[model samples]
Structure formats: C-alpha cells, structure tokens
Target: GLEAVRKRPGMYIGSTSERGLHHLVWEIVDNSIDEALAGYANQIEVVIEKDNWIKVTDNGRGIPVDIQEKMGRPAVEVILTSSVVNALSQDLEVYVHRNETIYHQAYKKGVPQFDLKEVGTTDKTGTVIRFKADGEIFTETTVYNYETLQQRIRELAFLNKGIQITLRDERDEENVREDSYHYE
Candidate 1:
C-alpha cells in the first residue's frame, strides 16, 4: 500500500499542497483521537519542528508492543503501517511506553531502519509518532500553518471533553508558539 502511494502521490494524498501535507498530520492525530474515544487517553501534544517533522504524543494506554499471533508481528509495527504517514513520510519513528517498558522502532521510506528493539524502561504510559514528510511528495509547502492547525486542534478539544490537545510550533528562532485546549 505504501509503495502504491509512492508511485502516485497525488492519487493518494490529493496534492502536494499545504492541505495534503496537513492531511498526513491529521492521520496521526486521528489515531490519538481514537485512543481518547476508547477511554485510554486524556492528553495529546502535537509539536511541529523546523525540519518539517511532526510529533504526536498521547497519554493513552500505549500501543501493544507484544507480538501478535495473527500477523506474527508486534502490534506497534502493524498499527504504524495503518496510517498514510508510512507512505508519505521519508522517515518515521514510533515509541510505545507502557508497564515500565519502552518499545522503539524506526522506519525510512516504508522500510524498517532497525530491528524492533526494547529501548529501556520508562514510567510513562503513552505513544509517540514522529515523522518527516517526504520532500519529493510535498515540495510546495514544507512549513505548517500554526494558526490553521491550532484552530482545528481547538475544535477537536471542544468536541472531546476532558481530552486536552496542545499544539506547539518550534519553527521560530526568536520565539516558540504553543497553545492548548480542553473543554471546561
């Protein structure tokens, strides 16, 4: 599926504009939202880097890192591929921290960069998805609109009461912008 999307980027992502670029971000955010809907998450933080990378962190139950019998693969590995980011991203990394254990995996151009390794132990309970959009696929806009993203994020927070969402822009050198939302 990722290979097919790479072959015809437009057919998969609509276009290489700001809208399409944001589409990739939304896909990951949607997964975090799903966790919140399932009563596993209460907070989500999205950070946009100057290097065109986006990171979505959620304080959810975390992804299952244990091997699954059906696919003979860890659930984290399988679920990462479920997002379009796997196809549109040049590099992607996933961190699942739960039960005092941390699972780390990295991929480049849809290929695993390293073996599924245990990073260490952590007191955290959540998941983080970080990726850089493929420059070839999204050449028009490497920069994300902070205002646009904040608007949509606030909307999501409004819709999902108790689910706090934070948007941070680290692209500015002089000052960084950060905003968060949650229903009262």
Candidate 2:
C-alpha cells in the first residue's frame, strides 16, 4: 500500500536529508525525460517556485485520464504509480493536457483531495506536476539548491540529444533566473 512508502520512505528515497529532498525533483524530472526519450516530447521545463515548490512540465503525450478497468479510478490516479512521489510530497498536483481537454487532480501525502475533473480546454499535449517537499520527512532542509538541479539537468540534456530542457528559479520574484539546455 502507499502508506508503506510513507512509513519506510528511507527505503524508497534513501534518507530524509537534503540529498533525498533533491531526489524528489529527479523523480518527476526523469519521468518527463522518459517522455522526451520516447520522442513524444521535445521540451521539458523545471521551475523552483516560491515557497519551495518544484514544478516540472513537458510537452509530451499527456498522462491518460480515462477510467481504468481494474483500479476503477481515473487513469491519471492509476498512472500515478509513482504515488510514492506523491507519498513523499507534502502537496502534489497534476495538470494533464490530452485529448483536447485539460484535467487536474491534487493530493496530500499521497491521498487524493478530489476526483480528477475537466478543468478547461487545451490545444496542447503534455503534463505539469508540481509539488512541495514534505518538511516532516525532509527535516534537514526542504529547500532546493539551484546548482544541484542545474548540474544534473545539464548532464541529462547533454546525454539525451534533441530535447530542449530549461531550469528556472522563481523563488526570488524580483530577480528570476533561468537556464536552458539542448544537444543536437
């Protein structure tokens, strides 16, 4: 069950330290990279938001939002197989653009706040996942380091050619910063 991950989170993320905290960004970013690697996506954007939230967006085929046969829940919830990511986050949200429709769902400690629903209309196809690290789990520090994310995102871009990935720091509103990467 999902609670298992919350109880033994160290087993999943290794530790509750800052290193583990940064790993959360990797979990979601790598998921976006997977879509890019599959050639369905071409751009990935990562933002370190105010209040320590992390947002990762990709222009890939959005996560399926239909009903699942076995789980009987929205496919987005089922596909959230990485609910461990959700379990580890204090707050997690997903906005999916697919089938010409936009769908959304949110969670806290891996528990859904509401059933997924149509939020609006979109001509885009992609996904956006935003989350805040669980301060209780990451007692050492829930804040993210820019150089750490910049370094890996740079390497991932260099290793995976043709995908354009960008990292932005928006925590400082007056002085926003950004870095973009691409290899082709």
Candidate 3:
C-alpha cells in the first residue's frame, strides 16, 4: 500500500509541493490532536528545523511499545507501517517516551533502520516525530511557509479548545519565530 501511494502521489498526497508538504505535517499532527481530544494531551509542539525537517512532539501516552505477539514487531512499528506519513518521508525518526523508558527508531521511506531500540530513560511519556520530506518525491519544493502553518495551527487549537499548540520556525538561525495558541 505504501508503494502504491508512492507510485501515484497525487491521490494520497495531492501534489509534491508546498500544499502536499503541509499535508504531511497535518497528517502526522492529527493523531496528537486525537490525544488532546481524548483528554490525555494538553500540549503539542511543532518545529521546522534547518534541513527541511519538521518535528512534532506531544506529551500524550507514547505509542504502545510492547511487541505485538501476532505481528512480532513493536506495536509502534506495526502501526507506522500502515500510516502513510512514514512512507512519505525521505527520513523519519520516532522517539517514544513511555514506561519510564525511551525508545527510538529511524526509517527511510517507511523501512525501518533497525528494530525499535531502547535509547534512554525518561520520567515522562509522549511521542516525538521528525521527518524530512522526500526530495525525490517532493520534486517541486521542500520549503514550507511559516505563516501558512501559523494560521492553520491557530485554528486547530481554537477548534480543539484549551490545548496548547505551538508552532516554531528555526529554519532561520538568526531570526527564529514561535507562536503558541490555546483556546479556552
């Protein structure tokens, strides 16, 4: 299915430009939105980094890390296989902070770098995903519009009600901008 979508980019991605780039971010973001709606997450942070990588971090329950007995893969790994966002990225990273432990995984075009490995320990729980839009796939442009993201995030925060959603642009080192919205 990932291959199918990659082959016909339009149907799944709409286009390989800024619109599509933003779509990928939104696609990854909405799951965290779900967490907020479920009353588990009160904050979500988005950061655009120097190398066209977008990072999303939410302090929700981290994706289930236990191995799926039937599939014989970490639950997080199994779910991302079906999730289109991983397949769309040239490189993708997942950090799961759960059970007082942190697990990390890296993927390229939906393929895992290695099995999910415990990296460190954390007293917190959440998921942080950072991915680079595939250059070959997004041939038109990999750049994103900061204001476009700012406006959309503001509305999503408004609609969701009271959960903090912050958008930060660090693509410019000399001049960085960050805005946060929370609707009561």
- Please give the lDDT score for candidate 2: 0.88
Write out the backbone clash pairs for model 2: none
Off by over 4 Å in 1: none
lDDT of 2 by residue, 17-60 (tens): 88898888888888888898788999999999999998999999
RMSD of every prediction: 1.5, 1.0, 1.0
Q: Considering TM-score, which of the candidate structures 1 and 3 is the better prediction for this target? A: 3
What's the residue-level lDDT of 117 in candidate 2?
87
Model 1 clashing residue pairs (backbone) = none
For 1-184, candidate 1 gives per-residue lDDT tens digits of 5777788878777877889988888888998899999998899999998786899999989988778899788878777666577877889999888779988999987778876788799987999888998888787888888878888998899999888899998878679888988887
Expressed as tens digits, the lDDT of each residue in 1-184 for candidate 3 is 6888778878877867778888998998999998988989999999999988999999999899888889788899999877677888889999999999999999989988898998898999999999998888888888989888888998898898889999999988999888988788
| Candidates, ranked, lDDT | 3, 2, 1
Q: List clash counts for every candidate, in order.
A: 0, 0, 0
Q: Candidate 1 — what's its lDDT?
A: 0.85
lDDT of 1 at 158: 91
Task: Report the C-alpha displacement of residue 21, candidate 3, in angstroms.
Answer: 1.2
Q: Judged by lDDT, which candidate is best?
A: 3
C-alpha RMSD in Å of predicted model 2 compared with the true structure: 1.0
Residue pairs in collision within model 3: none
